[PDB]
Ligand binder design. Structure first.
Ligand SMILES: CCCCCCCCCCC(CCCCCCCCCC)(CO[C@@H]1O[C@H](CO)[C@@H](O[C@H]2O[C@H](CO)[C@@H](O)[C@H](O)[C@H]2O)[C@H](O)[C@H]1O)CO[C@@H]1O[C@H](CO)[C@@H](O[C@H]2O[C@H](CO)[C@@H](O)[C@H](O)[C@H]2O)[C@H](O)[C@H]1O
Ligand SMILES: CC(C)CCC[C@@H](C)[C@H]1CC[C@H]2[C@@H]3CC=C4C[C@@H](OC(=O)CCC(=O)O)CC[C@]4(C)[C@H]3CC[C@]12C
Ligand SMILES: CC(C)CCC[C@@H](C)[C@H]1CC[C@H]2[C@@H]3CC=C4C[C@@H](OC(=O)CCC(=O)O)CC[C@]4(C)[C@H]3CC[C@]12C
Ligand SMILES: CC(C)CCC[C@@H](C)[C@H]1CC[C@H]2[C@@H]3CC=C4C[C@@H](OC(=O)CCC(=O)O)CC[C@]4(C)[C@H]3CC[C@]12C
Ligand SMILES: CC(C)CCC[C@@H](C)[C@H]1CC[C@H]2[C@@H]3CC=C4C[C@@H](OC(=O)CCC(=O)O)CC[C@]4(C)[C@H]3CC[C@]12C
Ligand SMILES: CC(C)CCC[C@@H](C)[C@H]1CC[C@H]2[C@@H]3CC=C4C[C@@H](O)CC[C@]4(C)[C@H]3CC[C@]12C
Ligand SMILES: CC(C)CCC[C@@H](C)[C@H]1CC[C@H]2[C@@H]3CC=C4C[C@@H](O)CC[C@]4(C)[C@H]3CC[C@]12C
Ligand SMILES: CC(C)CCC[C@@H](C)[C@H]1CC[C@H]2[C@@H]3CC=C4C[C@@H](O)CC[C@]4(C)[C@H]3CC[C@]12C
Ligand SMILES: CC(C)CCC[C@@H](C)[C@H]1CC[C@H]2[C@@H]3CC=C4C[C@@H](O)CC[C@]4(C)[C@H]3CC[C@]12C
Ligand SMILES: CC(C)CCC[C@@H](C)[C@H]1CC[C@H]2[C@@H]3CC=C4C[C@@H](O)CC[C@]4(C)[C@H]3CC[C@]12C
Ligand SMILES: COc1cccc([C@@H](C)NCCCc2ccccc2Cl)c1
Lengths: 298, 274, 126, 228, 61
């Protein structure tokens, strides 16, 4: 499995922590510690919007599935929602959600008026953006929650935390259905398999693992003796046959999920691979690194 | 076969041996603070150019032939300019390093390494263009002079055009003046990052040695002419080979305890405090 | 699952000795640096000792220097602490802590209030 | 150019965005950023008389200092955010012997952290007056907590401030030497520590930070050009 | 002068004396072959140059 860099997106000033693809599979949003979000047009390598932030320390960003809003947050314990489409013609802060007691590590939209967040205070939350209040709070992790992954049907979601633990939550009731263990260190990234009956986790263990919801246990492990660095990001292809994972060795590895055999390496960055994403049509892979660069591979 | 030619050949071979020894010492201690402080790649290029300078000095001796008279002047004219260009670029880079006041230069390693050679090639390329124009328009030739004396035939070289030689000399002097200016600026820096011995070389080789040979070059004929050339060349080469390396070589081989990271760190901190 | 179990505590007269053991499971024990920490009544957590993977590097805190010794058997996947000449202030609950990530020397958050890779501890009274 | 008119206007908009980004690039690359660390009772809040952020100015150079305090006890994850900062300013209370070993362990953890392997540390040994009074009083003994103090002698290069007692100097330099010997075991020349003695009335701290940052930048530039 | 080239007496006079003597010796070692090569009316010129160079050296040093 050989991929090549088709686009290189330049313009950020500092390390990039987060990125998120649009549903149209063409526009993406990226976040840097310089204090800026940028919406890139992948096809033309054009800057559509540059949003300055009130806080430089941003750790996450999300793109609304409708395409009318973006979200961000970080060490300021606040989730900011920016309205992209206004009559005045400029991006303005739509809402400023407060209530977490720790840094905001991840956020994902459900629709235009619902968002799910995970924080460093060892909890997740479901918000109503209009009222700015937490409709639900998910508790149970004994460590910082790093990443979360919404289900394709937007009914369930998993969270992985710095206690070698992942938890499955139902948004409507607000209770932990199942708890998955098996890692030895902090989980840094988590992602569902496309049909929704399995998910993959990466950690500082330098191993990725596949868990199945129905069997309530892991099925496969992905590691090599040479690898001693932790996984920062993980994602699946459109069909789930390939598992893409970025590491601290400045490289991304492609794994045959069904056989746990490495099939290729994406090696173009010169610093830590912080964020990774795959388009909704499965046509490209975006990797953003601490070297202030974001690349498209196909 | 003449004793004077033997002496000149021995001096050139001795210079070549010393240059090779210095190069080998620098290669051996290639990852030590003293050798790191003086740009490695530019030092290697400069040492190769000094070897070329001695080889060029070797062209003048012998019975003049057309190709030798063609090749003799451009060889030294290009080699000396290459040496001066290396020194100039090195001083300019160290000045830019020491004058920066911003968290990081953000200067790519490959980009800087290639940029150094690119600037060096600019200078040498102007020299090569002048030489190519000269050799295309009016090549120098050999000539059996039978007018200077009645009993003697002098086999000498006729310069195709004195204007081209004047242009080579003028360009070399201009580049040397620019290098002198930049080296004069870089004298307050720590002693490991200075190139203030180029001032000494210019004082002792350009204003004393080369000056004192002006009358000899003004009115003289026959083998002595070539003599002056060779001697002048040797002087410059030896002086340069001294003023840039010998002291450092000493500290690298003898007094080895001064070739330590702590010494360089202390000197840089002292520069920072002042 | 990461499990650390401490044993070998109780009440001992001053000047005695005591051996603490920590059994580890759910991870590769030889890949991690290990620590011994204590918490005294009315006081917070206090780092006591640590030992590296191969056991070549061993460090103590000041009060225990010479009186205590730390060791590890990677074949048995167990950590040992020998305690000699117990001063009356040695009374505390002792924890065997594991460093968060393998192949590292830095060990953040071992004396934190809520650290996942720690144990229940053993009470030592002098 | 095989571009439509609207595509060309989009390109022009992107160009204007790039110009604004370049201006922000100049502004951002001008300013130095510092991370303030140190436990409570050390007085890190009042080190510069100029609290999550702070601006100050020293001779036409801008410093921006960050004190992260609204988080949990664990700092293993968010600390990675501060790996581009010019300096970590670590403040240690020099009078309390009961919690000095905790400060030593924290300084060790910061110094050997993987993502802080290139950041230099400016060390402020605060509260020197209280240490001096406690030493001259004699109620507290460093030997109780640090037995190595007995087999210690004052440095040859140690400087006594005009008017003082040798015991006070011995205590000060022992405290400094603990952090220094921590700092001179894994540095490898990539990063260094700058220790200072500062009381509460001291007002020279900003100048010391300025000089230390100058030195840090010089060393970084030398290494980047592969000259050191 | 070279024995005490590091002594700082009289604004570090010994270093300048050493440099001046080096200039003198270089001037005359270069004078030898320059005089041996000159032919005609210019054989005096070299002497003047030498007489200038060395002299200037001392002053400037
Ligand atoms: C055909 C025309 C030829 C022109 C060629 C001239 C080239 C440029 C002039 C340079 C020059 C000649 C002065 C000429 C006198 C004029 C006529 C005199 C007649 C009477 C009127 C001016 O020398 C001046 O000397 C000043 C006196 O010290 C000094 O001042 C300072 O100190 C004040 C005191 O405390 C203080 O207060 C003031 O603040 C300071 O600034 C100036 O910085 C310096 O410019 C000498 O430059 C010096 O040359 C040295 C080489 O020997 C050279 O050392 C290098 O090499 C050494 C050995 O290899 C090696 O050992 C050294 O390590 C190495 O560094 C020095 O770097 C260079 O500087
Ligand atoms: C910053 C400082 C160090 C300036 C550096 C300049 C030197 C490299 C230049 C300045 C004057 C030059 C000299 C000026 C005049 C001559 C005369 C020239 O004599 C002839 O060309 C023969 C007569 C003729 O054929 O016209 C030989 C080169 C020489 C010695 C030049 C050699 C190089 C010199 C010393
Ligand atoms: C044919 C002959 C007459 C050639 C002429 C040579 C001299 C009359 C000139 C040529 C180059 C000149 C030098 C070129 C450069 C400098 C550097 C300059 O230094 C600085 O100004 C830098 C100060 C700093 O920024 O630190 C002082 C004058 C000086 C020595 C000049 C002094 C006079 C020189 C030697
Ligand atoms: C074939 C024969 C007749 C050769 C005659 C040529 C001489 C006029 C040349 C040859 C060797 C040259 C010397 C070679 C080396 C040096 C070292 C150099 O020493 C330093 O620069 C010391 C540096 C410092 O001061 O730290 C001074 C010039 C000098 C004497 C050169 C001056 C001119 C010399 C004597
Ligand atoms: C060629 C004809 C037309 C006239 C001959 C004049 C030259 C041979 C003279 C004139 C100016 C003289 C120079 C004037 C000043 C100096 C400064 C002097 O520098 C120092 O000695 C300072 C060293 C220190 O600062 O320690 C070295 C000799 C030198 C180059 C002199 C060498 C001989 C020069 C070039
Ligand atoms: C004509 C000139 C350039 C030829 C130069 C040849 C000499 C200077 C070179 C040729 C091969 C070189 C050697 C090659 C490899 C090593 C191994 C190293 O660990 C120490 C230095 C040493 C031993 C080198 C010293 C310099 C050396 C001997
Ligand atoms: C500060 C810089 C510009 C000074 C540069 C001066 C150089 C370019 C000047 C100074 C004296 C000049 C020389 C003076 C006399 C002659 C004799 C002539 O028959 C050929 C050219 C030649 C040899 C000149 C070449 C150019 C020269 C070397
Ligand atoms: C004409 C040529 C070939 C002679 C070669 C002799 C060389 C190798 C000798 C001659 C005199 C020597 C110098 C004499 C004095 C010093 C000063 C000292 O602090 C550093 C070494 C140094 C600079 C010596 C280096 C070696 C040296 C330059
Ligand atoms: C052809 C032959 C005779 C030329 C011989 C040149 C002699 C005079 C030269 C060659 C090497 C020179 C030495 C090289 C280096 C230094 C170091 C310097 O800090 C003081 C001068 C000193 C010590 C020089 C004195 C003069 C010297 C010995
Ligand atoms: C008239 C001319 C040709 C005589 C030339 C003689 C030269 C080669 C002689 C004369 C004086 C000698 C110098 C006298 C003093 C010293 C200082 C000593 O610590 C090293 C040798 C050194 C540096 C000598 C080197 C050689 C020297 C320069
Ligand atoms: C820098 O001047 C040059 C440029 C190229 C070649 C040459 C030489 C190889 N031939 C002419 C020699 C000119 C000359 C005569 C007496 C004293 C010094 C000098 Cl230099 C010199």
């Amino acid at each position: 499995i050989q991929m090549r860099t088709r686009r290189t997106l330049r313009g950020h000033l500092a390390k990039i922590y987060a990125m998120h693809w649009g549903t149209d599979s063409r526009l993406l949003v990226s976040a840097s510690q310089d204090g800026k979000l940028i919406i890139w047009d992948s096809y033309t390598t054009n800057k559509v919007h540059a949003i300055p932030l009130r806080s430089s320390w941003v750790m996450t960003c999300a793109y609304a599935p409708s395409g009318n809003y973006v979200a961000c947050g970080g060490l300021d314990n606040i989730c900011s929602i920016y309205n992209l489409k206004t009559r005045e013609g400029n991006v303005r802060v739509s809402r400023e959600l407060a209530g977490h007691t720790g840094y905001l590590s991840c956020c994902r939209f459900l629709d235009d008026n619902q968002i799910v967040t995970s924080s460093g205070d060892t909890t997740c939350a479901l918000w109503d953006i209009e009222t700015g209040q937490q409709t639900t709070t998910f508790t149970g992790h004994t460590g910082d929650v790093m990443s979360l992954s919404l289900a394709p049907d937007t009914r369930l979601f998993v969270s992985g935390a710095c206690d070698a633990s992942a938890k499955l939550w139902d948004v409507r009731e607000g209770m932990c259905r199942q708890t998955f263990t098996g890692h030895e260190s902090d989980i840094n990234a988590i992602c569902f398999f496309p049909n929704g009956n399995a998910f993959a986790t990466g950690s500082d263990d330098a191993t990725c693992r596949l868990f199945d919801l129905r069997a309530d246990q892991e099925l496969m492990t992905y590691s090599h003796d040479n690898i001693i660095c932790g996984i920062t990001s993980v994602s699946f292809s459109k069909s789930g046959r390939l598992l893409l994972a970025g590491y601290d060795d400045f490289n991304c590895n492609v794994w045959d999920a069904l056989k746990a055999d490495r099939a290729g390496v994406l090696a173009g960055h010169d610093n830590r691979v912080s964020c990774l994403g795959v388009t909704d049509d499965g046509m490209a892979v975006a990797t953003g690194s601490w070297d202030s660069f974001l690349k498209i591979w196909n | 076969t003449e004793p004077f030619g033997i002496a000149l050949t021995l001096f050139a071979v001795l210079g070549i041996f010393l240059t090779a020894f210095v190069l080998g010492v620098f290669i051996k201690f290639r990852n030590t603070p003293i050798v790191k402080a003086t740009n490695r790649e530019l030092s290697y290029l400069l040492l190769f150019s000094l070897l070329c300078c001695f080889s060029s000095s070797l062209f003048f001796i012998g019975e003049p032939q057309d190709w030798t008279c063609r090749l003799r002047q451009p060889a030294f004219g290009i080699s000396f300019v290459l040496c001066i260009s290396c020194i100039l670029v090195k001083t300019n880079r160290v000045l830019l390093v020491f004058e920066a006041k911003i968290p990081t230069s953000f200067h790519r390693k490959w980009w800087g390494l290639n940029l150094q050679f690119l600037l060096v090639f600019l200078c040498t390329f102007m020299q090569i263009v002048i030489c190519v124009i000269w050799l295309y328009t009016a090549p120098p030739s050999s000539y059996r002079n039978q007018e200077l004396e009645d009993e003697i035939i002098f086999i000498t070289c006729h310069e195709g055009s004195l204007m081209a030689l004047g242009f080579l000399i003028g360009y070399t002097c201009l580049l040397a003046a620019i290098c002198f200016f930049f080296a004069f600026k870089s004298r307050k820096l720590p002693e490991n990052f200075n190139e203030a011995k180029f001032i000494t070389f210019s004082m002792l080789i350009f204003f004393i040695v080369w000056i004192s040979f002006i009358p000899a070059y003004a009115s003289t004929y026959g083998k002595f002419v070539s003599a002056v050339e060779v001697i002048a060349i040797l002087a410059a080469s030896f002086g340069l080979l001294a003023c840039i390396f010998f002291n450092k070589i000493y500290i690298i081989l003898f007094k080895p305890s001064r070739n330590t990271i702590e010494e360089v760190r202390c000197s840089t901190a002292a520069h920072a405090f002042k | 699952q990461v499990q650390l179990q401490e044993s070998g505590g109780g009440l001992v007269q001053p000047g005695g000795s005591l051996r603490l053991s920590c059994a580890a499971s759910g991870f590769t024990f030889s890949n991690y640096k290990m620590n011994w920490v204590r918490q005294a009544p009315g006081k917070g957590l206090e780092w006591v000792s640590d030992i590296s993977q191969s056991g070549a590097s061993i460090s103590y805190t000041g009060s225990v220097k010479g009186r205590f010794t730390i060791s590890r058997d990677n074949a048995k996947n167990t950590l040992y602490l020998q305690m000699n000449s117990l001063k009356p202030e040695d009374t505390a609950v002792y924890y065997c802590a594991r460093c968060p990530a393998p192949f590292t020397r830095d060990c953040f958050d071992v004396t934190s209030t809520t650290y996942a890779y720690r144990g229940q501890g053993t009470q030592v009274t002098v | 150019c095989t571009l439509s008119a609207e595509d060309k206007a989009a390109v022009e908009r992107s160009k204007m965005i790039e110009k604004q980004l370049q201006k922000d690039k100049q502004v951002y690359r001008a300013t130095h950023r510092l991370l303030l660390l140190g436990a409570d009772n050390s007085g890190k809040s009042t080190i510069v008389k100029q609290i999550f952020e702070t601006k100050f100015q020293v001779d036409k150079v801008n410093f921006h200092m960050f004190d992260v305090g609204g988080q949990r006890d664990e700092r293993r994850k968010w600390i990675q955010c501060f790996n581009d900062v010019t300096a970590i300013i670590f403040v240690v209370d020099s009078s309390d012997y009961n919690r000095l070993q905790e400060a030593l362990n924290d300084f060790k953890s910061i110094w050997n952290n993987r993502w802080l392997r290139t950041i230099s540390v400016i060390l402020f040994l605060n509260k020197q007056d209280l240490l001096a009074e406690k030493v001259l009083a004699g109620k507290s003994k460093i030997e109780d907590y640090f037995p190595e103090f007995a087999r210690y002698t004052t440095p040859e290069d140690a400087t006594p401030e005009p008017g003082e007692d040798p015991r006070v100097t011995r205590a000060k330099y022992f405290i400094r030497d603990e952090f220094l010997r921590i700092s001179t075991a894994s540095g490898d020349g990539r990063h260094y520590c700058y220790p200072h003695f500062t009381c509460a009335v001291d007002t020279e701290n900003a100048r010391r930070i300025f000089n230390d940052c100058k030195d840090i930048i010089l060393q970084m530039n030398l290494r980047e050009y592969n000259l050191v």
